[PDB]
């Protein structure tokens, strides 16, 4: 589930 890896990466500032 790489889609969520990206989502969480996108979550970090």
Rounded Cα distance between 9 and 12, Å, is 5
C-alpha 3: how far from chain center: 7
Distance CA 1, CA 13 (A): 21
Cα 6 from Cα 1, distance rounded (Å): 9
Method: NMR
Two tokens, residue 6: 């990206």
């Amino acid at each position: 589930d790489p889609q969520h890896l990206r989502k969480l990466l996108q979550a970090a500032r």
